[PDB]
Amino acid sequence: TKVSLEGKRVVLVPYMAEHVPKYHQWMQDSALLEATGSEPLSLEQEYEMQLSWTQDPNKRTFIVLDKDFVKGDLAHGQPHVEAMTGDVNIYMNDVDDPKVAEVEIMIAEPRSRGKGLGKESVLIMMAYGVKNLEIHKFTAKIGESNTASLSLFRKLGFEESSYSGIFKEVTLEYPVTNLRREELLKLLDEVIRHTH
Ligand SMILES: CC(=O)SCCNC(=O)CCNC(=O)[C@H](O)C(C)(C)COP(=O)(O)OP(=O)(O)OC[C@H]1O[C@@H](n2cnc3c(N)ncnc32)[C@H](O)[C@@H]1OP(=O)(O)O
């Protein structure tokens, strides 16, 4: 990824080595680890994953910045550690269909929760996938007790498609209908790109 994406309240920037120390600190929250799909890493592994995640052709990943905390402009590829808030990604992980993508979202900083940053970050990333990856269905895998994430995805219009009692995990789907495709592309048309 060579660009960052500026919406109304968030900037989605490429995950950089400069972001790793704060990201690693977020991941010390066992609740965050369990709520996301994450295993605890060493710092070494966290740095190596920054390189591998961002080189993976089947993934798109961004660090979420809260625009209220950004100091300086978005035009020079700077990491803006001071505004780091979370992450968002899509993974094309369906062997049967390269136009299906799984979504993940995390807003790790309490000071930035409840401002609509998770919703906007997911919508921008979904729209990016529709335009550039031709995604026609998104999925989300959510722990059965994760009230906050279940609410977010359902309020976006994701619908439950299956449940694993073994893993205590709900899977939701978002078919990209003609109307949703139009809406998402219009939204992305208003997102400012910066070279990064
Ligand atoms: C598919 C996956 O990624 S599963 C893993 C999801 N990530 C996590 O669980 C990490 C821990 N939690 C988080 O990161 C955050 O709580 C998130 C991402 C779930 C929500 O981030 P926020 O930025 O606070 O959400 P945002 O402010 O954009 O609100 C969006 C919707 O989320 C829902 N929501 C957010 N927080 C809560 C909550 N505490 N309880 C219930 N619903 C909630 C609401 O429906 C809200 O819509 P409303 O504002 O109209 O009520």
GROMACS .gro file of C-alpha atoms and ligand atoms in nm:
model
  247
    1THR     CA    1   0.000   0.000   0.000
    2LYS     CA    2   0.127   0.335  -0.121
    3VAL     CA    3  -0.154   0.562   0.000
    4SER     CA    4  -0.331   0.676   0.313
    5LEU     CA    5  -0.706   0.738   0.318
    6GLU     CA    6  -0.853   1.043   0.488
    7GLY     CA    7  -1.219   1.041   0.582
    8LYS     CA    8  -1.424   1.273   0.798
    9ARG     CA    9  -1.298   1.162   1.141
   10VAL     CA   10  -1.023   0.906   1.067
   11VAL     CA   11  -0.709   0.869   0.859
   12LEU     CA   12  -0.615   0.515   0.759
   13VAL     CA   13  -0.235   0.503   0.723
   14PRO     CA   14  -0.004   0.216   0.626
   15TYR     CA   15   0.126   0.020   0.925
   16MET     CA   16   0.488   0.131   0.969
   17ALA     CA   17   0.777   0.020   1.188
   18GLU     CA   18   0.732   0.348   1.379
   19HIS     CA   19   0.388   0.223   1.494
   20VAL     CA   20   0.512  -0.108   1.637
   21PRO     CA   21   0.595  -0.004   1.997
   22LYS     CA   22   0.251   0.146   2.059
   23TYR     CA   23   0.074  -0.140   1.878
   24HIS     CA   24   0.267  -0.389   2.089
   25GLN     CA   25   0.157  -0.199   2.401
   26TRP     CA   26  -0.209  -0.222   2.294
   27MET     CA   27  -0.167  -0.599   2.254
   28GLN     CA   28  -0.072  -0.641   2.620
   29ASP     CA   29  -0.444  -0.617   2.699
   30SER     CA   30  -0.550  -0.981   2.722
   31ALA     CA   31  -0.906  -0.864   2.658
   32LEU     CA   32  -0.794  -0.697   2.331
   33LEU     CA   33  -0.599  -1.011   2.236
   34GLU     CA   34  -0.898  -1.240   2.295
   35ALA     CA   35  -1.149  -0.999   2.137
   36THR     CA   36  -0.934  -0.974   1.826
   37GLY     CA   37  -0.793  -1.287   1.667
   38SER     CA   38  -0.450  -1.223   1.811
   39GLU     CA   39  -0.189  -1.440   1.977
   40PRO     CA   40   0.064  -1.276   2.214
   41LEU     CA   41   0.387  -1.194   2.032
   42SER     CA   42   0.732  -1.093   2.142
   43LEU     CA   43   0.848  -0.750   2.031
   44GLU     CA   44   1.074  -0.920   1.773
   45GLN     CA   45   0.775  -1.103   1.631
   46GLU     CA   46   0.570  -0.782   1.631
   47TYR     CA   47   0.832  -0.611   1.415
   48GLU     CA   48   0.855  -0.909   1.181
   49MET     CA   49   0.475  -0.918   1.151
   50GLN     CA   50   0.466  -0.549   1.057
   51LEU     CA   51   0.680  -0.645   0.758
   52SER     CA   52   0.487  -0.963   0.673
   53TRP     CA   53   0.134  -0.822   0.716
   54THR     CA   54   0.209  -0.524   0.493
   55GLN     CA   55   0.372  -0.741   0.221
   56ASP     CA   56   0.086  -0.995   0.206
   57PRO     CA   57  -0.088  -0.963  -0.134
   58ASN     CA   58  -0.411  -1.103   0.011
   59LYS     CA   59  -0.440  -0.851   0.295
   60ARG     CA   60  -0.494  -0.477   0.317
   61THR     CA   61  -0.413  -0.325   0.654
   62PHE     CA   62  -0.414   0.023   0.799
   63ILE     CA   63  -0.348   0.190   1.131
   64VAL     CA   64  -0.643   0.410   1.230
   65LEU     CA   65  -0.562   0.768   1.329
   66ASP     CA   66  -0.809   0.989   1.518
   67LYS     CA   67  -0.803   1.316   1.324
   68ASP     CA   68  -0.869   1.516   1.644
   69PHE     CA   69  -0.519   1.416   1.766
   70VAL     CA   70  -0.321   1.448   1.440
   71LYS     CA   71  -0.048   1.712   1.471
   72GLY     CA   72   0.077   1.824   1.130
   73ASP     CA   73  -0.026   1.739   0.778
   74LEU     CA   74  -0.097   1.407   0.608
   75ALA     CA   75   0.104   1.480   0.292
   76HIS     CA   76   0.453   1.353   0.383
   77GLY     CA   77   0.416   0.985   0.476
   78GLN     CA   78   0.453   1.050   0.848
   79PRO     CA   79   0.333   0.786   1.096
   80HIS     CA   80   0.159   1.024   1.342
   81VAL     CA   81   0.219   0.798   1.643
   82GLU     CA   82   0.055   1.071   1.855
   83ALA     CA   83  -0.281   1.001   1.688
   84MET     CA   84  -0.269   0.620   1.669
   85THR     CA   85  -0.605   0.474   1.770
   86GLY     CA   86  -0.638   0.123   1.630
   87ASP     CA   87  -0.627  -0.082   1.312
   88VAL     CA   88  -0.849  -0.212   1.033
   89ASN     CA   89  -0.791  -0.474   0.770
   90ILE     CA   90  -0.946  -0.700   0.510
   91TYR     CA   91  -0.821  -1.047   0.422
   92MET     CA   92  -0.911  -1.233   0.102
   93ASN     CA   93  -0.913  -1.578   0.261
   94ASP     CA   94  -1.184  -1.773   0.074
   95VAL     CA   95  -1.022  -2.031  -0.155
   96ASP     CA   96  -1.356  -2.064  -0.339
   97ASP     CA   97  -1.399  -1.694  -0.418
   98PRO     CA   98  -1.129  -1.425  -0.447
   99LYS     CA   99  -1.398  -1.155  -0.422
  100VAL     CA  100  -1.488  -1.239  -0.060
  101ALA     CA  101  -1.304  -1.061   0.220
  102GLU     CA  102  -1.303  -1.091   0.598
  103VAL     CA  103  -1.298  -0.764   0.796
  104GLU     CA  104  -1.128  -0.690   1.128
  105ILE     CA  105  -1.148  -0.366   1.328
  106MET     CA  106  -0.998  -0.251   1.658
  107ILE     CA  107  -1.024   0.089   1.831
  108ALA     CA  108  -0.773   0.038   2.110
  109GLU     CA  109  -0.751   0.387   2.266
  110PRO     CA  110  -1.034   0.458   2.515
  111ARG     CA  111  -1.006   0.834   2.452
  112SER     CA  112  -1.119   0.772   2.092
  113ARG     CA  113  -1.401   0.523   2.149
  114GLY     CA  114  -1.761   0.618   2.084
  115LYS     CA  115  -1.675   0.881   1.821
  116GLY     CA  116  -1.773   0.670   1.519
  117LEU     CA  117  -1.414   0.587   1.431
  118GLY     CA  118  -1.471   0.211   1.416
  119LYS     CA  119  -1.775   0.254   1.191
  120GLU     CA  120  -1.603   0.495   0.951
  121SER     CA  121  -1.284   0.288   0.933
  122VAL     CA  122  -1.480  -0.029   0.847
  123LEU     CA  123  -1.687   0.154   0.583
  124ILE     CA  124  -1.382   0.313   0.418
  125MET     CA  125  -1.202  -0.022   0.410
  126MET     CA  126  -1.510  -0.199   0.273
  127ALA     CA  127  -1.544   0.067   0.002
  128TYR     CA  128  -1.173   0.036  -0.081
  129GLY     CA  129  -1.221  -0.338  -0.124
  130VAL     CA  130  -1.525  -0.294  -0.347
  131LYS     CA  131  -1.346  -0.051  -0.580
  132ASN     CA  132  -0.998  -0.204  -0.593
  133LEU     CA  133  -1.044  -0.572  -0.505
  134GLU     CA  134  -1.392  -0.609  -0.658
  135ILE     CA  135  -1.518  -0.753  -0.329
  136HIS     CA  136  -1.882  -0.860  -0.352
  137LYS     CA  137  -1.927  -1.003  -0.001
  138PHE     CA  138  -1.765  -0.924   0.332
  139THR     CA  139  -1.755  -1.148   0.638
  140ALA     CA  140  -1.683  -1.085   1.005
  141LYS     CA  141  -1.597  -1.344   1.271
  142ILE     CA  142  -1.690  -1.222   1.618
  143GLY     CA  143  -1.671  -1.375   1.962
  144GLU     CA  144  -2.016  -1.458   2.099
  145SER     CA  145  -1.970  -1.232   2.403
  146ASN     CA  146  -1.824  -0.935   2.211
  147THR     CA  147  -2.123  -0.708   2.256
  148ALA     CA  148  -1.950  -0.404   2.108
  149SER     CA  149  -1.834  -0.565   1.784
  150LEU     CA  150  -2.154  -0.762   1.727
  151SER     CA  151  -2.347  -0.435   1.764
  152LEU     CA  152  -2.118  -0.246   1.524
  153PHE     CA  153  -2.138  -0.501   1.242
  154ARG     CA  154  -2.512  -0.556   1.279
  155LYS     CA  155  -2.570  -0.181   1.275
  156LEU     CA  156  -2.373  -0.164   0.949
  157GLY     CA  157  -2.612  -0.421   0.802
  158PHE     CA  158  -2.413  -0.744   0.840
  159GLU     CA  159  -2.642  -1.044   0.892
  160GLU     CA  160  -2.562  -1.361   1.085
  161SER     CA  161  -2.470  -1.651   0.856
  162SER     CA  162  -2.345  -1.912   1.101
  163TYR     CA  163  -2.243  -1.987   1.458
  164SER     CA  164  -1.972  -2.210   1.600
  165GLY     CA  165  -2.054  -2.323   1.951
  166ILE     CA  166  -1.713  -2.491   1.961
  167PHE     CA  167  -1.530  -2.160   1.926
  168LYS     CA  168  -1.806  -1.940   2.072
  169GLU     CA  169  -1.791  -1.742   1.749
  170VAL     CA  170  -2.056  -1.577   1.532
  171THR     CA  171  -1.995  -1.529   1.160
  172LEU     CA  172  -2.181  -1.243   0.989
  173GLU     CA  173  -2.197  -1.158   0.617
  174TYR     CA  174  -2.250  -0.844   0.409
  175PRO     CA  175  -2.352  -0.909   0.047
  176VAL     CA  176  -2.258  -0.612  -0.171
  177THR     CA  177  -2.586  -0.548  -0.352
  178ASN     CA  178  -2.615  -0.299  -0.637
  179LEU     CA  179  -2.736  -0.029  -0.398
  180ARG     CA  180  -2.462  -0.101  -0.143
  181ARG     CA  181  -2.199  -0.098  -0.418
  182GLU     CA  182  -2.322   0.246  -0.534
  183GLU     CA  183  -2.328   0.381  -0.176
  184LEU     CA  184  -1.979   0.252  -0.095
  185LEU     CA  185  -1.824   0.387  -0.412
  186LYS     CA  186  -1.984   0.728  -0.350
  187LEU     CA  187  -1.840   0.725   0.002
  188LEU     CA  188  -1.493   0.635  -0.127
  189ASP     CA  189  -1.514   0.913  -0.389
  190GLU     CA  190  -1.513   1.160  -0.097
  191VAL     CA  191  -1.212   1.000   0.077
  192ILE     CA  192  -0.891   1.196   0.020
  193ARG     CA  193  -0.583   0.999  -0.081
  194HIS     CA  194  -0.234   1.096   0.035
  195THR     CA  195   0.087   0.951  -0.105
  196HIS     CA  196   0.247   0.749   0.166
  197LIG     C1  197  -1.470  -0.871   1.319
  197LIG     C2  198  -1.385  -0.818   1.431
  197LIG     O1  199  -1.296  -0.735   1.415
  197LIG     S1  200  -1.420  -0.884   1.589
  197LIG     C3  201  -1.305  -0.786   1.689
  197LIG     C4  202  -1.356  -0.643   1.702
  197LIG     N1  203  -1.259  -0.568   1.781
  197LIG     C5  204  -1.262  -0.570   1.921
  197LIG     O2  205  -1.346  -0.638   1.982
  197LIG     C6  206  -1.155  -0.486   1.985
  197LIG     C7  207  -1.212  -0.423   2.112
  197LIG     N2  208  -1.320  -0.325   2.086
  197LIG     C8  209  -1.308  -0.225   1.992
  197LIG     O3  210  -1.210  -0.221   1.925
  197LIG     C9  211  -1.425  -0.125   1.979
  197LIG     O4  212  -1.503  -0.146   2.090
  197LIG    C10  213  -1.503  -0.143   1.849
  197LIG    C11  214  -1.414  -0.140   1.727
  197LIG    C12  215  -1.581  -0.273   1.854
  197LIG    C13  216  -1.599  -0.021   1.844
  197LIG     O5  217  -1.514   0.087   1.825
  197LIG     P1  218  -1.595   0.241   1.843
  197LIG     O6  219  -1.505   0.327   1.762
  197LIG     O7  220  -1.610   0.259   1.991
  197LIG     O8  221  -1.728   0.213   1.766
  197LIG     P2  222  -1.805   0.345   1.698
  197LIG     O9  223  -1.795   0.457   1.796
  197LIG    O10  224  -1.756   0.358   1.556
  197LIG    O11  225  -1.961   0.295   1.717
  197LIG    C14  226  -1.998   0.218   1.610
  197LIG    C15  227  -2.105   0.121   1.661
  197LIG    O12  228  -2.043   0.023   1.743
  197LIG    C16  229  -2.138  -0.021   1.838
  197LIG     N3  230  -2.072  -0.013   1.968
  197LIG    C17  231  -1.951   0.051   1.998
  197LIG     N4  232  -1.915   0.038   2.127
  197LIG    C18  233  -2.018  -0.039   2.181
  197LIG    C19  234  -2.040  -0.088   2.310
  197LIG     N5  235  -1.949  -0.059   2.407
  197LIG     N6  236  -2.150  -0.163   2.342
  197LIG    C20  237  -2.236  -0.187   2.237
  197LIG     N7  238  -2.230  -0.148   2.109
  197LIG    C21  239  -2.117  -0.072   2.083
  197LIG    C22  240  -2.264   0.067   1.833
  197LIG    O13  241  -2.360   0.003   1.757
  197LIG    C23  242  -2.207   0.190   1.754
  197LIG    O14  243  -2.305   0.244   1.681
  197LIG     P3  244  -2.390   0.375   1.774
  197LIG    O15  245  -2.271   0.466   1.785
  197LIG    O16  246  -2.491   0.413   1.669
  197LIG    O17  247  -2.437   0.306   1.901
   0.00000   0.00000   0.00000
